[PDB]
């Protein structure tokens, strides 16, 4: 079942990336319309797909980033990130 | 008779610069300008420039004055007109072209050689994927990602040339070249035939026999 | 710097009948000095006109030119079956540069014929490369003119198929065209029924070639 | 083999994303300093792997992108890029 993985495989867990730009709503929509989610940062923080997963949206909205965020994060709507669907 | 003749068919990489010789034959070399003119597969035939093959002075159009260079040789009697720098658009066949005027003047062209295909592109050669077209029943080939042309597609070493169409290339967006070559059969003819597309890309030498099969299930 | 516009589109009239075609200048061409050449698919240009009127050696008696100003005019009596190409009129009046104009088709004039349609799934030896490409054939058709739109679940698809036409064909003198819907295999089998739907002057009501993902 | 890839398996070969940016030569030392090759352009230009490749190293030099480069008409051929290692 890894090889119908045509993206990042993790324990079981099939992350498809989407090299398309969209807002946090809109790739959660994007994301539920093929049956996935957003990746979650606490999943990924220290593991090797971190470096695939970089400036790309989570599932708190806040996008996933190598450190914890720098405590001035203000408004995350309105911007297009990519995102992958697992 | 007057000849004028190019080792043409030159796909290069943008960035590069590509030189199309003409050897021309039949009349006084030193007596009249050889003109070059540039045909685009969506713009039409635009005058280029000129040469004087008894001065070496050169008189070039706007969009191509120093971006282009023409030289030539008394001794093998040759006008070279060289494009530096190339880039995506300058894709195009390049005529040479003898006018019939003398000297420093302008008038109808004359004699015209054949022309110089030049596809400018950053691809790389890639041999071809053939994917079957299943089954007046028809069935054909998709050739897919391949680069550069020509590929030559044959069906059955080139038995049946009825009903066959081999469509001209399609460039896509990765930059890769594609086609489809399909023919029209009798449906009498599904079971006791098996159908060959024999596919031959010459840059890349890849020859494939794909067997078009009638769908199964 | 006068511009060479070819009012003809495509000249289409059957063999021998009478072809007319229209080269007009910008501005005034000094001393009449215009061109006509005749270029055969994948040939050089031939010379056929000089000083508006006056024929090359070795060029049938049926070509014809004439105008002035800004209106010249090339004719052909009869249609000969090499006169099927394209034509160009050049100016060399006011020149630098000699410019030349944009070229008219000659086609040729034959009865309405249908479009036979074939729509064709990829095969499976492409549903594993992680593409998709599903292609519709039209076969033997006249006019060109034909308007080919994919339905995926009859939804119209925009910006996802290429389009091919080939030459005249040398026995019935119709066209041939291919259209190829080219998506992801994720796309493919997230959804069932795949449609080709096919306008055209030959038929009555627009023809559905479908299948289902099977 | 594929779970003890932690990267992209595709045919058979694992490619290793590297997030640091180094020139061509750098990249190619650290490919070959870990047993493995930039990726072939070709083997993964018609694949779902470009979205991971983008504008990252290529085994002949020239990076990997989706279209067709239109003008290069730049000499100095010096950029840092992403690389993966095979």
């Known amino acids: 079942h890894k090889e119908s993985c045509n993206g990042l495989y993790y324990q079981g867990s099939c992350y498809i990336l989407h090299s398309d730009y969209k807002s946090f709503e809109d790739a959660k929509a994007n994301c539920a319309a093929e049956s996935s989610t957003l990746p979650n940062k606490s999943d990924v923080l220290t593991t090797w797909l971190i470096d695939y997963v970089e400036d790309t949206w989570g599932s708190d909205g806040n996008p996933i980033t190598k450190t914890t965020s720098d405590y001035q994060d203000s408004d995350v709507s309105q911007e297009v990130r990519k995102y992958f669907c697992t | 008779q007057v000849q004028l003749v190019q080792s043409g068919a030159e796909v290069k990489k943008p960035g590069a610069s590509v030189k199309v010789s003409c050897k021309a034959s039949?009349?006084?070399?030193?007596?009249?300008?050889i003109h070059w003119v540039r045909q685009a597969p969506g713009q039409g035939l635009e005058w280029m420039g000129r040469?004087?093959?008894?001065?070496?002075?050169?008189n070039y159009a706007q969009r191509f004055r120093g971006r282009v260079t023409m030289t030539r040789d008394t001794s093998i009697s040759t006008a070279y007109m060289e494009l530096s720098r190339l880039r995506s658009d300058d894709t195009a066949v390049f005529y040479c072209?003898?006018?019939?005027?003398?000297?420093?003047?302008?008038?109808?062209?004359?004699?015209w050689g054949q022309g110089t295909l030049v596809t400018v592109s950053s691809a790389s050669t890639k041999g071809p994927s053939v994917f079957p077209l299943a089954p007046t029943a028809a069935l054909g080939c998709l050739v897919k990602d391949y680069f550069p042309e020509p590929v030559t597609v044959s069906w059955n070493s080139g038995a049946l040339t009825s009903g066959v169409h081999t469509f001209p290339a399609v460039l896509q967006s990765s930059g890769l070249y594609s086609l489809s070559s399909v023919v029209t059969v009798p449906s009498s003819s599904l079971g006791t035939q098996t159908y060959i597309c024999n596919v031959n890309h010459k840059p890349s030498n890849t020859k494939v026999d794909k067997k078009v099969e009638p769908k199964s299930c | 710097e006068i511009v060479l516009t070819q009012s003809p589109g495509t000249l289409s009239l059957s063999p021998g009948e009478r072809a007319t075609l229209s080269c007009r200048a910008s501005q005034t061409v000094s001393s009449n000095f215009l061109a006509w050449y005749q270029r055969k698919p994948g040939q050089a240009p031939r010379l056929l006109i000089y000083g508006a009127s006056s024929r090359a050696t070795g060029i049938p008696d049926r070509f014809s030119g004439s105008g002035s100003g800004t209106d010249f005019t090339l004719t052909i009596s009869r249609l000969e079956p090499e006169d099927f190409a394209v034509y160009y009129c050049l100016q060399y009046g006011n020149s630098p540069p000699p410019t030349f104009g944009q070229g008219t088709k000659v086609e040729i004039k034959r009865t309405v014929a249908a479009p036979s349609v074939f729509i064709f799934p990829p095969s499976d030896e492409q549903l594993k490369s992680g593409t998709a490409s599903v292609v519709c054939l039209l076969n033997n058709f006249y006019p060109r003119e034909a308007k080919v739109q994919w339905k995926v679940d009859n939804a119209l698809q925009s910006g996802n198929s290429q389009e091919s036409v080939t030459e005249q064909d040398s026995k019935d003198s119709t066209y041939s065209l291919s259209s190829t819907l080219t998506l992801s295999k994720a796309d493919y089998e997230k959804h069932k029924v795949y449609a080709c739907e096919v306008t055209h002057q030959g038929l009555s009501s627009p023809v559905t070639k479908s299948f289902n993902r099977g | 083999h594929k779970e003890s890839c932690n990267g992209l398996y595709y045919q058979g070969s694992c490619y290793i994303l590297h997030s640091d940016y180094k020139s061509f030569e750098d990249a190619k030392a650290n490919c070959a300093a870990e047993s493995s090759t930039l990726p072939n352009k070709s083997d993964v230009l018609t694949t779902w792997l470009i979205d991971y490749v983008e504008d990252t190293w290529g085994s002949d030099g020239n990076p990997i992108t989706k279209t067709t480069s239109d003008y290069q008409d730049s000499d100095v051929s010096q950029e840092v890029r992403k690389y993966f290692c095979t």
């Open positions: 040469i004087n093959p008894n001065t070496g002075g050169t």
């Open positions: 039949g009349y006084t070399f030193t007596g009249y300008y």
């Open positions: 072209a003898k006018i019939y005027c003398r000297g420093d003047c302008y008038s109808y062209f004359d004699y």
